Amino acid sequence: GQGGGTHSQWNKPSKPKTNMKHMAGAAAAGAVVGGLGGYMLGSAMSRPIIHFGSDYEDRYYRENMHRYPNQVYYRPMDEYSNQNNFVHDCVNITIKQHTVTTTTKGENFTETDVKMMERVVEQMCITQYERESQAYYQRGSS
DSSP: OOOOSOSOOOOOSSOSSOSSOOOOOOOOSOOOOSSOSSOEEOOOOSOOOOOOOOHHHHHHHHHHGGGSOSOOEEOOOTTOOOHHHHHHHHHHHHHHHHHHHHHTTSOOOOHHHHHHHHHHHHHHHHHHHHHHHHHHTTTOOO
């Protein structure tokens, strides 16, 4: 198209983290990526869970959770990211990369498997929101 994204940017009025700031750290030794380069992951979460309110869904999503991705791929906030697009392209790409890289060797994911992943993979990006949100709020802490 002629462009993409919006110059309009919005956050939440509630501060994104508690007043007690903390240290963090990271390291790298390479990464296993679905041939992206421009889409990388941050961290993994402690068991993403969705709430479907159905016995068969709460069972199936948890049975296949063993095969779901542990992480998502995203871009830093950089004070110029849309709050929704951050999470929304996250899972879109992640499922595309995982479902392909897994099926490439012999695997398959049905509609339901994908549906559970859509919410699960999205939920892991929502948690990464808070991780990366501190990065823009590192300088723009007001």
